[PDB]
Amino acid sequence: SMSVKKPKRDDSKDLALCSMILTEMETHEDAWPFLLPVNLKLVPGYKKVIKKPMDFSTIREKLSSGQYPNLETFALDVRLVFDNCETFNEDDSDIGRAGHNMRKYFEKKWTDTFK
Numbered sequence: 001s002m003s004v005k006k007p008k009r010d011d012s013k014d015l016a017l018c019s020m021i022l023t024e025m026e027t028h029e030d031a032w033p034f035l036l037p038v039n040l041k042l043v044p045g046y047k048k049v050i051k052k053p054m055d056f057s058t059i060r061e062k063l064s065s066g067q068y069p070n071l072e073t074f075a076l077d078v079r080l081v082f083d084n085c086e087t088f089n090e091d092d093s094d095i096g097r098a099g100h101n102m103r104k105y106f107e108k109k110w111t112d113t114f115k
Contacts, residue, residue: 019063021106022060022063023108024105032100035056036057058077078106086099
């Protein structure tokens with residue numbers, strides 16, 4: 001509350017560390033469905049169904065341009081990518097499995113880096 005604060009967590013490295021995590025996601029072999037925005041002209045249903053498209057390249061641009069106020073808003077966009085993927089793709093598909101693998105990969109990096 002006013003003039004009553006928890007001890008100040010050092011957040012000065014968060015930007016760099018989220019960048020490294022994102023690099024590692026970008027270079028994972030199963031990243032291919034998530035590297036670029038889904039092409040809304042060429043993928044019937046996507047525009048109407050997925051209200052908030054997100055992809056790694058869009059996260060990278062947001063990150064590099066100071067559009068994440070904190071590390072939680074960054075994790076929310078990463079998770080959005082996988083939530084979208086689950087919304088549109090059957091679990092038993094290459095893309096569906098890619099999404100599950102990437103989300104696991106992400107969540108471990110996230111825990112190990114920050115928890």
